Design a protein around this ligand. Structure first.
Ligand SMILES: OC[C@H]1O[C@@H](c2c[nH]c(-c3ccccc3)n2)[C@H](O)[C@@H](O)[C@@H]1O
Ligand SMILES: OC[C@H]1O[C@@H](c2c[nH]c(-c3ccccc3)n2)[C@H](O)[C@@H](O)[C@@H]1O
Ligand SMILES: *Cc1c(COP(=O)(O)O)cnc(C)c1O
Ligand SMILES: *Cc1c(COP(=O)(O)O)cnc(C)c1O
Lengths: 810, 810
């Protein structure tokens, strides 16, 4: 059908069809007369997977021949989503498979919808790991993703009476055709025990053994014939484990619980033992694997020339004391040499400045679970503080602040401090965030080792986030400037010379309308709701958080509703306001915000005076595959975090790439996005970081805003009196009380500027031609936000490897 | 190589090799330079499995077209062993696969040894189910095996310091290529709740839901192109299950525990809730499946014309009240009509008369777990006892004895009584056992419904138990009389005309010597022990039990040792005494017997005066794949149960088929085996059932035997004084005390006759020609003990279906 989906050669289509029927018969043991769509999806998955295998074997082969430096990306999260369409895109099989399935009387798009999301992540951090693996494969780096094969990923979200209910994401029920179990590379992981000191150093003894069994998933690069590996570990009990008899066998579950379930907190720290076990489990098994591979080429001087370990936040911070333990206790290197190797090997990416997200593990936990790692952490701390003392003599305050050990009722290890001490590079994930790390939480560390601190602004893979999710847009771009841009997104600047072309303006606007029609129909089919596709699609999709200020959006929505009721017969630009996202199950306030959003929807969507002029939709079960549907359908992207709270964001970039205008604060990567496009092409409002600081010094009094803004007072009165909760008048008292007395994120401080800025959005939407010209200026400058740029920068400035766009042979 | 292994056609071998390399590349994602023997085994398994698939699909297809009466074999146990060689035998692929693997530079026998036993059974009962499925497929019956996919089968047995240690049988670690998950046929199973009575009858409400997910394993018939299905259910939690969040997800394990582990008791009842859950789980899911299949052809009059349900012991007895519950509560049949359907559908196989093995479930357990089933059991009991009262007026004693409810401190349901009431046929498993059921435990039931009681003498599949395990013997037989006998074992009688043929005598004796050389070498390689292959191989392999009297064997072994020490320089026929078997983990006395066997071995095997004249070996981890090795190597089969305790036995038949002479009691199928061969061709000794009864009436005084037999007194003195346990003199006090005061199985009563009979065995072994002529008379009359005979009898006399030996098309 479309050019960027590749060729459907007669030979190719014939072979896909005979192999589809082969898998249906032999692999699935079905005849055509009993096959369900699920069977047909599986037969297609096995057929496409067959095209990965030779390329996978040859890539791993080639890395053995060439022995390049190897990148290990350690993350507790890989938010992969569906694999089938991504695999077809990267192997140029998409049109062939469409043709092949079409001729067997099947609709490939219908089969794609059967695949479960691999939801092994919470949001931005997990999805950044998935975009990174894609770019690492596309740039020909000998890169391995290492994490945990959770049996249960991020929970499925149901709305019941407007409340979030959680249910278990049983993503493996029907099998995962993409993974290959490697039970032959199973490795022991140790817990508990105690430390004996002998003549020949320290010995970790009387430990509990859990087995780590790896599952390999292929990561195909974009048409370069490179297939990298994501290795995920699964917890297994040893067979002599607990070994009356029956109970011992049933108690195997205690050990296997380690890999059972993803912790569902976004940008929040829960200090639970099971979480600590997950962190050690992935680090211990991964480092044994790294070292085994290194030794198959006594001398660890060359370790950092052959190995880079990237730490995705502090979650795998124990890689630092673990590497020391292996090098000192088992390989018998002296401390100083082992430490040199560790620092040149490890690099740390910080993702947040929110204090409630920073990992601070109680010492009693580490003491019981990892007694040796705690001894090593104490030794790191002493030698680290001896360097601080020598550089800043007499600055006892500095020693206290920089300590890896925090004093208090309970002593804690500051895992961020451990990561900075033990890494040659510390990076933030957007320029403003990296600047904030050097001015505030890590100022002391910056003054000691300025050279360690870098910026690597986040990116998104334009394969998933344009070609895959928005083929129509990819095609009209490819008509004008060709296909090269998909692996070189900077080429999108060539589109600035089409900003006054009538045909291109028409085509950009037609694709957006087609995406909106397609999304509006998806809503009717799967969730019986009737949206006006001529309306402006105002979309805020991200995890539910106070700092992301869904509540600010709620205040705008209620303002639009109150303005319609005041002057019913006046023209307003019609809007579909769509808000979606999961709350962490224990985050009470996030669960209350979901309930308020649906409560507003119940009043607004059933007011006859409002008509189709204002619709409020809560998008259920927001996940990667729903993002692929709604982001191409969006006109306005809502990026409205309090300045200084959103480290980067990556939703922001997805919408920029897909032809939505951004209303946002100068927060995270919003700042670089406005710089790339021009501020006049961005709906910027509200406090800068500097303004938030001034308000904090003076003191935030929400009452002042309530007393000065009648429109805002009216909304707070509506919430309090039960306008939005007639049966339970007091339902939202916790929300009002927080906004008036305990708002860390200063929602009222940005209310007036937000509403005025939303009026400018409405005004521009009335002029479709100028709306679309501004869209083109955004798409055309979105090239910086490719994760290919991000990874090339990690590779050159941190890992010391040169990316490559050259094909491996097929 | 040998004719009964089929043809190795040039076309066939070429295709096996290209498909082996296809699976190695695409299925296993390995190149040849990294493949382990385990990879090569898997590539061969996937290649052979490809030959099953078309035949499997067409067989299930054919049963839909023809809609024959369908047999459902319900068992908690299927002791399948390895599948690879059995599949090749039944598809005639064995020589082709040998040739194909040979040309790729691999030894097929080495790859066969990598396959894990499917050990989803304890011993005789589980293995009878496996032999039955094979014969049902071979006789073209539309038969389904239904059971539980245990994650852990019968435990692996390690000997440590001569003690049994148990470790978890993790048989799925590396994957099962033979099974096909069918998550699309997942069915709900209900537990707990309560009963509401409404206008429209009883309703089971507020239940806990566990999901049953089926796994299908193919059961190929012998060269008839029939492939039947074994469906095993796995416990899965529903996704709203327990639905703070983390703990709810981890608590899913409580529901999935149902299918976690096989209860490892042979011929013993443990009244545990988890065991009761396993029994209902398999019955509830199976009956929904049976009924779904029946409805795809309102009218249940024809149910028994389309459905037979065979109950393998009382373990699935709840099929009776469950079928009633479905027919009455859900389908709204009247009681009387539903009961008629149930009785004509169900048949019950009894496997034991040992009181400690009979299932008697406490009422409080059924009351909590299955409240409705208990109401139905009470209703069955009342109507059943009303028939007894009418047939035997005034016989109140009879009413008490026949009740399904036993009175006592705790009330119990007698599941055997439930099975007889609810079945049109009750069978024992050997003629003497079936006679004992009518004279003793079921005399009352026999007098009410004489017509229900049948015999179906057990059998073994000559595919696994001759062709597969003893190709050399199968071949020399096939040289004389052809291949037909493999599916018609009665044809072995034609061998009686070769009993005076010198060439055949030579060939029978050569195969036995080759099997002994091969077994002796297997012992050295895997367990560093040096046996004389010229010695008589005296083998007792079976579960460790008091009733099976391994202790009697021990007393003989110690007698031979004491006779050598008394007269060191006298000639004795050399013996390798091999005893093997697992004890149930909680069976203290069985664990003590293992320790005594190894304690005897430590004294005997290290006495220089003994030399290679007497060796005592404990065969570790006795299981199906060890039986396939040791049974062909055996000269003497030990079947020495107290008369009336061994319902049938099936080990006895395996050895008869494989050229061993039997020393045994007139117990179980030993009686029919001696009748078939002639008593003069059998080493029969000891009390008959009648003699045991006489001793019981008089009273068993073990002291009398100890006082009258000096040789026996000496052995008991050795055990007591620590001759066999120098470091712990009192180690065996429990064994002596039981033999002297509490021996239910009368070991001393059979000691003198056993030793004298063992002297006759030694005397015949000195005359190899006459030993082998007696072996030929045994092999030649073993045809009755084919499970093909057994199943043809079940089919004609119970299920009302005609077996067939006609090929399906390929
Ligand atoms: O860099 C990837 C994205 O990372 C997110 C993040 C921080 N911290 C976490 C987390 C923390 C604990 C457990 C799970 C996730 N996730 C930031 O909030 C985004 O601003 C940024 O875009
Ligand atoms: O009929 C199959 C064989 O069945 C055995 C049996 C009875 N009972 C049991 C059992 C009982 C409970 C749990 C597991 C197994 N297993 C008899 O002991 C043999 O004599 C006979 O050969
Ligand atoms: C990209 C993405 C995110 C991150 O979005 P932000 O707006 O940066 O919070 C979260 N969830 C999913 C499913 C995503 O695809
Ligand atoms: C046949 C068999 C049995 C039953 O043997 P008996 O002598 O009848 O107790 C037990 N275990 C295995 C592994 C078998 O193959």
């Amino acid at each position: 059908q479309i050019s960027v989906r590749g060729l459907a050669g007669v030979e190719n289509v014939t072979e896909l069809k005979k192999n589809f029927n082969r898998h249906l018969h032999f692999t699935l043991v079905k005849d055509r007369n009993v096959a369900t769509p699920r069977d047909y999806y599986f037969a297609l998955a096995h057929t496409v997977r067959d095209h990965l295998v030779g390329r996978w074997i040859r890539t791993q082969q080639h890395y053995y021949e060439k022995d390049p430096k190897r990148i290990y990306y350690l993350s507790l999260e890989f938010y992969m989503g569906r694999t089938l369409q991504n695999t077809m895109v990267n192997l140029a099989l998409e049109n062939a498979c469409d043709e092949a399935t079409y001729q067997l009387g099947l609709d490939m798009e219908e089969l794609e919808e059967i695949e479960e999301d691999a939801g092994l992540g919470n949001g931005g951090l997990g999805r950044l790991a998935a975009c990174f693996l894609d770019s690492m494969a596309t740039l020909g780096l000998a890169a391995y993703g290492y994490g945990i094969r959770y049996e249960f990923g991020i929970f499925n979200q149901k709305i019941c009476g407007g409340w979030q209910m959680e249910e278990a994401d049983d993503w493996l029920r029907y099998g995962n055709p993409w993974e290959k179990a490697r039970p032959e590379f199973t490795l022991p992981v140790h817990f508990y025990g105690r430390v004996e000191h002998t003549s020949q150093g320290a010995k970790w003894v009387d430990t509990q053994v859990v087995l780590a069994m790896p599952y390999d998933t292929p990561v195909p690069g974009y048409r370069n014939n490179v297939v990298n590996t994501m290795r995920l570990w699964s917890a297994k009990a040893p067979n002599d484990f607990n070994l009356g008899y029956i109970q011992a066998v049933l108690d195997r579950n205690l050990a296997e619980n380690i890999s059972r379930v993803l912790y569902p907190n976004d940008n929040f720290f829960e200090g639970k033992e099971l979480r600590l076990k997950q962190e050690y489990f992935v680090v211990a098994a991964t480092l044994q694997d790294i070292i085994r591979r290194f030794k198959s080429s006594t001398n660890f001087d060359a370790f950092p020339d052959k190995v880079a370990i990237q730490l995705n936040d502090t979650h795998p911070s124990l890689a630092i004391p673990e590497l020391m333990r292996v090098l000192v206790d088992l390989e018998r290197l002296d401390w100083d040499k082992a430490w040199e190797v560790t620092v040149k090997t490890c690099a740390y990416t910080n993702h947040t400045v929110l204090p409630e997200a920073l990992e601070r593990w109680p010492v009693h936990l580490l003491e019981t679970l990892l007694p040796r790692h705690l001894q090593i952490i104490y030794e790191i701390n002493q030698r680290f503080l001896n360097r601080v003392a020598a550089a800043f003599p007499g600055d006892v305050d500095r020693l206290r602040r920089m300590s890896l050990v925090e004093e208090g009722a309970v002593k804690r290890i500051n895992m961020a401090h451990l990561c900075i001490a033990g890494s040659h590079a510390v990076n933030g994930v957007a320029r403003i965030h990296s600047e904030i790390l050097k001015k505030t939480i890590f100022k002391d560390f910056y003054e000691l080792e300025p050279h360690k601190f870098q910026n690597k602004t986040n990116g998104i893979t334009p394969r998933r986030w344009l070609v895959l999710c928005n083929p129509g847009l990819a095609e009209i771009i490819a008509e004008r400037i060709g296909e090269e841009y998909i692996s070189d997104l900077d080429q999108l600047r060539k589109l600035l010379s089409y900003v006054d072309d009538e045909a291109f303006i028409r085509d950009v606007a037609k694709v957006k309308q087609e995406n909106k029609l397609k999304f509006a129909a998806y809503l009717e089919r799967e969730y019986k709701v009737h949206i006006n596709p001529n309306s402006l699609f105002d979309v805020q999709v991200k995890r539910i958080h106070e700092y992301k200020r869904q509540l600010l959006n709620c205040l705008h929505v209620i303002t639009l509703y109150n303005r319609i009721k005041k002057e019913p017969n006046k023209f307003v630009v019609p809007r579909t306001v769509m808000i979606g996202g999961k709350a962490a199950p224990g985050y009470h306030m996030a669960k209350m915000i979901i309930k308020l959003i649906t409560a507003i929807g119940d009043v607004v969507n059933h007011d006859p005076v409002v008509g189709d002029r204002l619709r409020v939709i809560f998008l259920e079960n927001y996940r990667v595959s729903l993002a692929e549907k709604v982001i191409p359908a969006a006109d306005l992207s809502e990026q409205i975090s309090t300045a200084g709270t959103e480290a980067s964001g990556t939703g922001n970039m997805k919408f920029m790439l897909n032809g939505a205008l951004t209303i946002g604060t100068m927060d995270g990567a919003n700042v670089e996005m406005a710089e790339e496009a021009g501020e006049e092409n961005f709906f910027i409002f509200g406090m800068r970081v500097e303004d938030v600081d001034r308000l904090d010094q003076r003191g935030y009094n929400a009452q002042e805003y309530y007393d000065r803004i009648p429109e805002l007072r009216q909304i707070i009165e509506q919430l309090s009196s039960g306008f939005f909760s007639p049966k339970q008048p007091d339902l939202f008292k916790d929300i009002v009380n927080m906004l008036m007395h305990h708002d860390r994120f200063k929602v009222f401080a940005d209310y007036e500027e937000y509403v005025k800025c939303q009026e400018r959005v409405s005004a521009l939407y009335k002029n479709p031609r100028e709306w679309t010209r501004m869209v083109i200026r955004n798409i055309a400058t979105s090239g910086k936000f490719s994760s290919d740029r991000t990874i090339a920068q990690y590779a050159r400035e941190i890992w010391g490897v040169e990316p490559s766009r050259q094909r491996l042979p097929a």
